[PDB]
């Protein structure tokens, strides 16, 4: 279930975000800076770590098993041992390939959208001043400075309506 943002309307992306996975790039009269939303990238890193808790470390302590490396042929029981070992390896290799496929697909799918929160946050003060922007850069007509982008980052944004431009 792709959401069509990271391959969609986020077409290039800027390469400098070393502190976080996501960010809030902007352009102001006092300088076009950057951001990093710690909540969203923290959620993403937490779910990656939760994925790797079942994977990285805490394996199954399988101590004694059957002999898999073989030699000159002995009987049908050696053929059965080779067959059960090969079917276990094929099942586990199919299962690991499937697990990689589902978790890579799910990682791409969840690390995608969740930018509707910014949309609905910006709506009620963006609905009046030159109406609604959603094309990937929020062309926010709230004439403001880095304090308003700080409030958008902080998720503490009020709605000071800009009635100077109602239609154009």
């Amino acid at each position, epitope marked *: 279930g792709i959401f069509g943002a990271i391959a969609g309307f986020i077409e290039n992306g*800027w*390469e*400098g975000m070393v502190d976080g996975w996501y960010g809030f*790039r*902007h352009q*102001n009269s*006092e*300088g*076009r*800076g*950057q951001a990093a939303d710690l909540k969203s990238t923290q959620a993403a890193i937490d779910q990656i770590n939760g994925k790797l808790n079942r994977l990285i470390g805490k394996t199954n302590e399988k101590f004694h098993q059957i002999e898999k490396e073989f030699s000159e042929v002995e009987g049908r029981v050696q053929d059965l041992e080779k067959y059960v070992e090969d079917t276990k390896i094929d099942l586990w290799s199919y299962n690991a390939e499937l697990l990689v496929a589902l978790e890579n697909q799910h990682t791409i799918d969840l690390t995608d959208s969740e930018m509707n929160k910014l949309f609905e946050k910006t709506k009620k003060q963006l609905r009046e001043n030159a109406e609604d922007m959603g094309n990937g850069c929020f062309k926010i007509y709230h004439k403001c400075d*880095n304090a308003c982008i700080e409030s958008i980052r902080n998720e503490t944004y009020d709605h000071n309506v800009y009635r100077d431009e109602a239609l154009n």
Partner: antibody
Amino acid sequence: QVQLQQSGAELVMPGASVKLSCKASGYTFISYWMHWVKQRPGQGLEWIGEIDPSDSYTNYNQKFKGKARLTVDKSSSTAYMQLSSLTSEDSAVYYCARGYYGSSGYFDVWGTGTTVTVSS
Amino acid sequence: DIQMTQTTSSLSASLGDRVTISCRASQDISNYLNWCQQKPDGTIKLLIYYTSRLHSGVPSRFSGSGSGTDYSLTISNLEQEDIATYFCQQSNVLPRTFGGGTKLEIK
């Protein structure tokens, strides 16, 4: 290795023009910004301007309008400094510095500097 | 323009001593400060970015903190390679402004 290789020293007439260079390497040029820092000997560090390697956004210091200009060449990964109307007060060491995007502006990688001297 | 000042012109400390260096901004510059180390040969290096976190590769003995207008940089245990001049930088409003500088010497 991220190193901003820089040119040598120059010596020109007062009132002449010079063009500096700073070759970026080891990293993608359009990612991080370029900033240049002037240090007169015995004086403090001064910030003169910033550029955006992706689309050439220009922001300059207030005291240096019409005097310092910023250009880049995205093909060669190079940041250029053209100076105009030079005076004896202009003699300094110009440091080419990398820069994190926008107004955050922490210069994660610095350069070596060019000894610019103005005399007759 | 933010007239940004380093009050301590110079300071001396011995090897292994805990030296604390500080600087003050004329206004509230939030939490964006940059500490620059200039060795006497000419190599500049940035130390503390965003007034709390340190650049990777810098030894862990360097530490800078502060909030509001007053900020400080603390070196827990000095060594021989730490002899340099230190500049502190604000970055909130254009243009960026560096500190007055302070040349640390060995007593």
